[PDB]
Design a protein around this ligand. Sequence first.
Ligand SMILES: *SC1=NC(C)(C)N(O)C1(C)C
Ligand SMILES: [Cl-]
Ligand SMILES: [Cl-]
Ligand SMILES: [Cl-]
Ligand SMILES: [Cl-]
Ligand SMILES: [Cl-]
Ligand SMILES: [K+]
Length: 163
Amino acid sequence: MNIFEMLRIDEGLRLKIYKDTEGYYTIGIGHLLTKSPSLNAAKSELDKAIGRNTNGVITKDEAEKLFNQDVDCAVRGILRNAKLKPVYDSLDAVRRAALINMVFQMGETGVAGFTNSLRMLQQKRWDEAAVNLAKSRWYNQTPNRAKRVITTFRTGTWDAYKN
Ligand SMILES: *SC1=NC(C)(C)N(O)C1(C)C
Ligand SMILES: [Cl-]
Ligand SMILES: [Cl-]
Ligand SMILES: [Cl-]
Ligand SMILES: [Cl-]
Ligand SMILES: [Cl-]
Ligand SMILES: [K+]
């Protein structure tokens, strides 16, 4: 297990434009295209991301290419953020994956707003951090995925993703 396998489980894989859990046009492995309700706008974003005129459908290779870019973007969002980077630096690699997962789903700014959770994670108070992370819109709107990510922070194992 690794961040790529983890996010592939949490995001799935779809080769045609679809709406994510927030109703936003998405493609591939959780690649958010736009928050605009315009499908034409979403299709233009896809053409720009892939570099060709699409019909709203991509290949699996293209989905995996966006995915690798998106994982990189998530890590770069952490490393450039004064609140996220110290926490990331303080974590083992399994828990680092859990933080990347959160930033992939909610973006740098969203996760940086978990000020008190981040402090508890940096203190390595895992059970307290787990409870605090669940007091969130994030947990309430996607509780099964959040549970898996929180269980990863709590235990430092991949147990929530194996099987
Ligand atoms: S990677 C990445 N994604 C967005 C579009 C947010 N960026 O500006 C980067 C840092 C190039
Ligand atoms: Cl791109
Ligand atoms: Cl088609
Ligand atoms: Cl690339
Ligand atoms: Cl430490
Ligand atoms: Cl709390
Ligand atoms: K998804």
